[PDB]
RNA sequence: ACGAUUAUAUCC
RNA sequence: GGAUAUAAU
């Protein structure tokens, strides 16, 4: 299970790091790395956090959930080097057994077919520095590894300096030689909100980012997959790139119209970690569709920086905090320019193969019969593009409506490819949904909503406890009321646009809007401006948003007749609202709703003497 | 100091 | 077009 570094590929980098840190370079033999080649360590200062901050306005306005642990245990993640290392031991420090011969044959035939179909109406191309210069956020991370690279205070200042692009040229000229001297990953813990356990916040995932020079070189050679929308639903059939979250239910309802079995949406456990060097090499086949200088640069990124990664990660130790130089050949580095696009690719390929195994196209990994190989190639030819349309795929999240239900029990290939399902035994047959409105996708399910007009909407919907929990906490420490009042309204605005159809969220949302100064306009998470005459985001121009998104711009809404009142906008049926976590019918909820003006007036008085508006007469 | 890819709102 | 905020992979 040990990792075999190629020191002819990653060797010059590890050395350059060493040289810049000679006063501290040691070789800890207490290093915990069981499946990653460890190369050294040196001293460094801890970054990260594990605190969470209370949004007082929302917590005061959501009292019935105080008693609900699925709300109240929500916290920010632990991104300290402790939190990272736990995540590392649990998820990133693992090995996937190389797939069997049959599997590798299935994967290559399917990868090669896929790129030819993705390339029928697109052509790979280099991206431009001007293109990079316009896209990059101005405060995106510099991520400098070497001292030659730590000259700028922002990415904007950097891409407007000749000396930045001189560095980029030095590595660019190496890449065209087949060598790499400077592309090293940084590491951090994903800052997000997770349910805690036993009074401890938990880390979530790893985030790997190279420096801004390297990130351009990625973008130069592979950005075209994103910039030219290769994984659009139009181009790839299976993808859903570019569609927002509210529109995804419409994409699912269509998929459901196909004749087939149940609808399956099995999560893969730690997808990025389970990406194998075979995967990494099937993904590289896109270079077969490239040319000239472009082909060399794309090969350089793939072999020297994706299939040969030098990662630089923090580990707590008794003698302060240290920084390990570790290296892995396989795995997707979360934060590579190709993360979203190439997870969609490989997942498309995976599910297809799983579709094939259910249909009988091949009977066993380890061995692909000369005859069977012909049947696979002819199955893609015959039905492959249709099989792709039976799927909705967003990176590793996927929904597959297969031909029959033998899909559920077709798992030899999926497991051998390393794509182990989460929360189910390796060979436990799969759970499948016969009602598309209950299929999870991009952390939601989707309800068909009949309007008072008779028109139908499809709307996103999740367990309420999940949404209230997240509105009630925030980045930071301690408690806050004024500093996160506009943040509460932001959440309220989201509840009214996406989840207007949950009684509790629309009530809570009008409450938060009523309790927050109406003339305050957010300038950051914790700062704002005050306009003397204008209110911000009134219940009327909230309704303008609801129309603009759900009627005017909704391509599944042929009748563009607006709604004139918030009372026109319907709700889910009570039993469904209840099923999806609503508190109606509980006694705590009734009291909360009756005395809601009393709690609004508390928050008002706690905030101070500002200007307020009642958003509640939208529900009478 | 603050990844890539993306949707939406808002402010300019 | 940018920034801010939220959300998704
Ligand atoms: Zn390089
Ligand atoms: Zn629901």
If you measure CA to C1', which residue is closest to nucleotide C8?
A442
Known binding residue A559? Answer is no
**Which nucleotide is closest, CA of A486 to its C1'?**
C5
Distance A62 CA to ligand 1 centre (A): 51
Ligand nearest to the CA of A175: 1
Cross-strand partners of A43: A322
Q: Scan for tokens 């949404």, then name that residue.
A: A467
Give the distance (Å) from ligand 2 centre to CA of residue A586.
Answer: 18
C1 closest protein residue (CA to C1'): A134
Same domain, A85 and A186: yes
A530 touches strand B (CB under 7 A): no
Residues A586 and A64: beta-carbon distance below 8 Å: yes
Q: Residues A64, A175: one domain? A: no
Domain boundary among A438, A464, A484: A438
Cα diameter, chain A: 81
Q: Which of A87, A89, A67 is nearest to A77 (CA)?
A: A87
Same domain, A320 and A207: yes
**Among candidate residues A391, A423, A438, the one where a domain is terminated:** A438
Per DSSP, the three-state class of A133 is helix
Q: How far apart are CA A178 and CA A296, in angstroms?
A: 8
Residue A215 CA and nucleotide B3 C1' are separated, in Å, by 10
Please give the structure tokens belonging to residue A55.
């949004």
DSSP H helices in A51-208: 56-60, 69-72, 81-87, 101-118, 129-135, 155-159, 162-175
Gyration radius of chain A's alpha carbons: 26
Which backbone phi and psi does A41 adopt, to 5 degrees?
-160, 165
Contact A455, A557 (CB under 8 A): yes
**C-alpha distances out from residue A590 to A365, A463, A586, A595, Å:** 59, 20, 7, 9
Query: Hey, how many other C-beta atoms are within 10 angstroms of the C-beta on A50?
Result: 18
* Residue A2: inside a domain: no
* A487, A584: one domain: yes
Mutual angle of helices A292-301 and A212-222, in 10-degree steps: 130
Token pair for A147 = 């001292």
- Answer whether any strand B atom is within 7 A of the Cβ of A128: no
Structural domain contains residue A11: no
Contact A445, A462 (CB under 8 A): yes
What's the CA–C1' distance between A530 and C6, in Å? 21
Tokens representing residue A32 in the block: 């915990």
Indicate which ligand has the atom closest to the C-alpha of A303: 1
CA atom of A497 to C1′ atom of B9, Å: 9
CA of A609 to the centre of ligand 2 (A): 39
Q: Which residue approaches B8 most closely, CA to C1'?
A: A244
If we measure between CA atoms, which residue out of A323, A328, A322 comes closest to residue A310?
A328
Q: Are residues A108 and A142 in the same domain?
A: yes
Coil vs helix vs strand at A150 = coil
- For A552, counting Cβ atoms within 10 Å of its Cβ (0-12 exposed, 13-18 middle, 19+ buried), the class is exposed
A397 marked as part of a ligand binding site: yes
Amino acid whose CA is nearest the C1' of B4:
A335
CB A511 within 8 A of CB A596: yes
Backbone angles phi, psi at A185, to 5 degrees: -75, 145
CB-contacted nucleotides of strand C (7 Å): 1-9
Task: Report how far residue A277's alpha carbon sits from residue A474's, in angstroms, rounded to the nearest whole number.
Answer: 38
Domain check: are A132 and A250 in the same one? Answer: yes
- DSSP secondary structure letter of residue A146: S
Distance CA A182, CA A337 (A): 17
Asked, for residue A63, whether it belongs to a domain, the answer is: yes
Contact A442, A274 (CB under 8 A): no
Q: What's the residue count for chain A?
A: 620
How far, in Å, from the CA of A182 to the mean position of ligand 1?
Answer: 5
The answer on A216 and A255 residing in a single domain is yes
| A83 and A68 together in one domain | no
**Among candidates A298, A132, A329, A130, which has minimal Cα distance to A215?**
A132
User: Which ligand is the nearest neighbour of the Cα of A460?
Assistant: 2
Considering the domain boundaries, does residue A27 fall inside one? Answer: no
Q: How many CA atoms lie within 13 A of A386 on its CB side?
A: 10
Q: Are residues A81 and A63 in the same domain?
A: no
Pairing mode, strands A320-328 and A37-44: antiparallel
Q: Which of the 8 DSSP states describes residue A302? A: I
Instruction: Measure the CA–CA gap between A375 and A73, rounded to whole angstroms.
Output: 52
**Which residues 6+ apart lie within 8 Å of A388 measured at CB?**
A117, A236, A237, A238, A348, A352
Nearest-CA neighbor of A330 among A369, A390, A284, A261? A284
Query: Nearest Cα to A365, choosing from A70, A85, A100, A62?
Result: A100
3-state secondary structure of A128: coil
Here the contacts of A580-586 (C-beta below 8 Å, separation 24 or greater) are A580/A461, A580/A462, A580/A463, A580/A464, A580/A502, A581/A463, A581/A464, A581/A465, A581/A466, A582/A464, A582/A502, A582/A503, A582/A504, A583/A64, A583/A65, A583/A464, A583/A504, A584/A503, A584/A504, A586/A64
Q: How far is the CA of A571 from the C1' of B4 (A)?
A: 37
Nearest ligand atom owner, CA of A440: 2
In angstroms, what is the span from residue A81 Cα to ligand 2's centroid?
37
A396 annotated ligand binder: yes
CA–centroid distance, residue A217 to ligand 1 (Å)? 8
As ranges, strand B nucleotides with an atom below 7 A of a protein CB are 1-11
Nearest Cα residue to A404 out of A361, A359, A360: A359
From A438, A467, A498, give the residue that closes a domain. Answer: A438
Write out the two tokens for A260: 């087939």
Pairing of strands A479-480, A52-55: parallel
Distance (Å, rounded) from C-alpha A473 to C-alpha A330?
36
Helix H or strand E encompassing A220 = helix A212-222
Give the ranges where A360-463 is alpha helix by DSSP (H).
370-379, 385-389, 412-416
Q: Say what the resolution is, in angstroms.
A: 2.8
DSSP state of A200: B
Nearest nt to the A241 alpha carbon by C1': B6
Residue A304, token pair as written in the block: 């020297």
3-class DSSP assignment, residue A125: coil
Query: Which H/E stretch holds residue A139?
Result: none
Round to whole Å and give the CA distance between A611 and A620: 22
Which residues lie across from A53 on neighbouring strands?
A474
Q: What is the DSSP letter of A245?
A: S
Q: How far is CA A322 from CA A36, A67, A89, A189, A552, in A?
A: 17, 41, 17, 16, 55
Sign of CA dihedral A407, A411, A413, A418: positive
Contacts of A587 (CB under 8 A, 6+ apart): none
A227 touches strand B (CB under 7 A): yes
Distance CA A92, CA A334 (A): 11
Q: Is residue A497 part of a domain?
A: yes
Listed by range, residues with Cβ under 7 angstroms from strand C are A 134-135, 137-139, 193, 245, 339-340, 343, 394-397, 442-444, 470-471, 474-475, 487, 490-491, 494, 522-525
Domain co-membership, A408 together with A519 = no
A214 CB less than 7 Å from any atom of strand B:
no
The Å distance, Cα A459 to ligand 2 centre, comes to: 9
**Residue A268 known to bind ligand:** yes
Ligand 1 centre from A215 Cα, in Å? 10
Query: Which residues lie closer than 8 Å to A429 by C-beta, 6 or more apart?
Result: A408, A409, A411
Q: Which ligand is nearest to the CA of A467?
A: 2
The two tokens of residue A459 are 């709307």
* A485-498 vs A503-515: helix crossing angle, rounded to 10: 150
Q: Tell me, yes or no, whether A302 and A403 share the same domain.
A: yes
Sign of CA dihedral A9, A11, A14, A20: negative
Task: Report CA(A486)–ligand 1 centroid distance (Å).
Answer: 43
- CB proximity A244–strand B (7 Å threshold): yes
Measured in Å, residue A376 CA sits from the centre of ligand 1 at 38
Reported as type and span, the H/E element at residue A278 is helix A277-283
Q: Is residue A28 within 8 Å of residue A318, measured between CB atoms?
A: no
CA–C1' gap, A584 and B3, in angstroms = 41
In a domain, A17, yes or no: no
The verdict on residue A7 lying in a domain is no
Number of CB atoms found within 10 A of residue A519's CB:
17
- The structure tokens listed for A26 are 């040691």
Number of domains in chain A: 2
Structural domain that includes position A544: 58-72+444-618
CB contact at 8 A, A203 and A89: no
Q: Does residue A399 fall inside a structural domain?
A: yes
What ligand is nearest to the CA atom of residue A179?
1
What residue has token string 């105080």?
A66
Measured in whole angstroms, the distance separating CA A357 from the mean position of its chain's CA atoms is 29
Q: Is A295 flagged in the annotation as binding?
A: no
Experimental method of this PDB entry: X-ray
Same domain, A274 and A179: yes
How far is A539 from A518, CA to CA, in rounded Å?
A: 11
Residues A510, A593: Cα–Cα separation, whole Å: 11
């Amino acid at each position: 299970e040990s990792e075999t570094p190629n020191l002819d590929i990653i060797g010059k980098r590890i050395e350059k790091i060493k040289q810049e840190h000679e006063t501290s370079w040691h070789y800890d033999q207490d290093h915990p790395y069981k499946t990653w080649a460890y190369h050294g360590s040196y001293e460094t200062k801890q970054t990260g956090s594990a605190s969470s901050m209370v949004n007082g306005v929302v917590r005061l306005l959501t009292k019935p959930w105080d008693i609900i642990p699925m709300v109240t245990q929500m916290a920010m993640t632990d991104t300290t080097p402790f939190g990272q290392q736990r995540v590392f031991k649990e998820k990133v420090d693992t090995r996937t057994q190389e797939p069997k011969e049959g599997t590798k044959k299935l994967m290559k035939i399917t990868a090669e077919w896929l790129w030819k179909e993705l390339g029928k109406k697109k052509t790979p191309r280099m991206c431009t520095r001007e293109e990079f210069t316009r896209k990059v956020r101005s405060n995106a991370a510099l991520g400098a590894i070497f001292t030659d690279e730590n000259k700028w205070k922002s990415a904007r200042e950097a891409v407007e300096d000749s000396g930045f692009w001189e560095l980029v040229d030095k590595e660019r000229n190496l890449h065209l030689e087949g060598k790499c001297e400077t592309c090293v990953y940084n590491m951090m813990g994903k800052r997000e909100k997770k349910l805690g356990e036993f009074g401890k916040a938990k880390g979530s995932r790893a985030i790997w980012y190279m420096w801004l020079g390297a990130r351009f070189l990625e973008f130069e050679a592979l950005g075209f997959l994103n910039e030219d929308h290769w994984f659009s639903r139009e181009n790839s059939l299976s993808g859903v790139e570019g569609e927002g979250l509210h529109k995804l239910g419409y994409i699912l309802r269509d998929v459901s119209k196909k004749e087939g079995g149940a609808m399956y949406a099995d999560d893969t456990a730690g997808w990025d970690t389970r990406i194998t060097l075979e995967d990494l090499k099937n993904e590289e086949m896109v270079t077969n569709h490239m040319e000239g200088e472009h082909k060399k640069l794309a090969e350089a990124i793939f072999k020297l920086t994706y299939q040969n990664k030098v990662v630089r990660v923090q580990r707590p130790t008794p003698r302060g905090t240290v920084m390990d130089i570790i290296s892995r050949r396989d795995q997707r580095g979360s934060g590579q320019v190709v993360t979203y696009g190439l997870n969609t690719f490989t997942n498309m390929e995976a599910q297809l193969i799983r579709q094939m195994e259910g249909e009988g196209v091949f009977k066993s990994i380890q061995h692909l019969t000369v005859t069977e190989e012909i049947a696979v190639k002819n199955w893609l030819v015959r039905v492959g593009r249709e099989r792709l349309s039976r799927m909705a795929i967003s990176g590793d999240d996927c929904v597959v409506k297969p031909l029959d239900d033998r899909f559920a029990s077709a798992l030899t290939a999926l497991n051998d490819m390393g794509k182990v399902r989460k929360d189910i035994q390796q060979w436990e047959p799969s759970r499948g949904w016969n009602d598309w409105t209950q299929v999870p996708f991009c952390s939601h399910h989707f309800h068909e909503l009949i309007m008072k007009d008779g028109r139908v909407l499809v709307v996103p919907c999740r367990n309420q406890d999940e949404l209230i929990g997240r509105a009630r906490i925030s980045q930071g420490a301690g408690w806050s009321l004024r500093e996160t009042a506009c943040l509460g309204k932001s959440y309220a605005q989201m509840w009214s646009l996406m989840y207007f159809h949950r009684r509790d969220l629309r009530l809570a949302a009008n409450a938060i809007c009523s309790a927050v100064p109406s003339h305050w306009v957010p300038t950051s998470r914790t700062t704002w401006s005050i306009h003397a005459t204008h209110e911000w985001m009134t219940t009327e121009d909230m309704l303008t948003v609801w129309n603009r998104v759900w009627i005017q711009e909704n391509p599944w809404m042929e009748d563009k007749t607006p709604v004139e009142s918030w009372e026109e906008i319907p709700y889910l049926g009570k039993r469904e609202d209840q099923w999806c976590g609503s508190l109606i019918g509980l006694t705590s909820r009734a009291t909360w709703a009756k005395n809601i003006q009393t709690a609004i007036n508390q928050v008002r008085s706690l905030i101070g003497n500002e200007e307020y508006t009642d958003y509640m007469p939208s529900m009478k």
